[PDB]
DNA sequence: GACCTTCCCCTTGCTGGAAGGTC
DNA sequence: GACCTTCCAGCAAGGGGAAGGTC
């Protein structure tokens, strides 16, 4: 297969394939004569778990990671898992934070008048001005 | 005031700093007749307004929209509202994604017996495989 | 005109570095 | 020696469109 085909059936665009080809986080696929990319159906798989894991939070670094594992049969299951719990806790600290967020938005907004005035007591608050 | 100063009470860095104020961010500073940046009040306000609003999760171009409301004082008071309720519902929608992927990790990591065998179910999910 | 290749710039929000001019 | 001023370079994670192959 060519890129275009591997992009579709992944959801990749072409661009990104060739960029986490050249990051070595996959691959690389063969060449043809012309130097067309020329992908079989472990490039499919490479490509398709990369994609997953970045729908799932993983970032690129550890998204590789995880297929360097897809690649080693005598990987243990357990230290994907072990990885996959840090992506939970992670994602949990950063849920934290945007509540904390939210919370401190939504008290300045209460006390917004919101009326047309010109006090605001959210810029008020934002600057430490008054 | 010099930047350094201005840095250290508003907990931005210099680099920052100008960074905001080539950016059209911020109102730019007045030089000496060395070109030393000096700084007033009102530009403490304004950079600490821009670093208020990026903790609370505004991003630079919003940010820069709430220091040209600062600098209205023919300003509503409700223009900001309606500001910052966007960024909470923004917030929220940014909560919900952050959520389908602690589920969808950690339905994967239930079914993963993490014991040292190489299948991992987590993997054969993530790439379509099997 | 339909893809294929490499080339480097645009982004967002900065942070670090190295030259040079003050303090 | 530690301030400041400028620009060079780059991190994620690719996007945009050049300039060319070649079927
Ligand atoms: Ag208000
Ligand atoms: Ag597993």
């Given at each position: 297969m060519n890129i275009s085909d591997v992009a579709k059936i992944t959801g990749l665009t072409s661009k990104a394939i060739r960029f986490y080809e050249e990051k070595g986080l996959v691959t690389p696929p063969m060449r043809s004569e012309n130097g067309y990319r020329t992908y079989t159906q472990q490039h499919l798989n490479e490509l398709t778990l990369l994609r997953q894991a970045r729908q799932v939070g993983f970032n690129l670094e550890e998204s590789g990671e995880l297929v360097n594992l897809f690649n080693?049969?005598?990987?243990?299951?357990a230290d994907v898992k072990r990885r996959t719990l840090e992506k939970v806790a992670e994602i949990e600290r950063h849920i934290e934070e945007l509540q904390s967020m939210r919370d401190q938005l939504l008290a300045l907004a209460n006390a917004?008048?919101?009326?047309?005035?010109?006090?605001?007591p959210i810029i008020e608050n934002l600057s430490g001005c008054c």
């Open positions: 080693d049969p005598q990987r243990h299951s917004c008048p919101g009326d047309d005035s010109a006090d605001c």
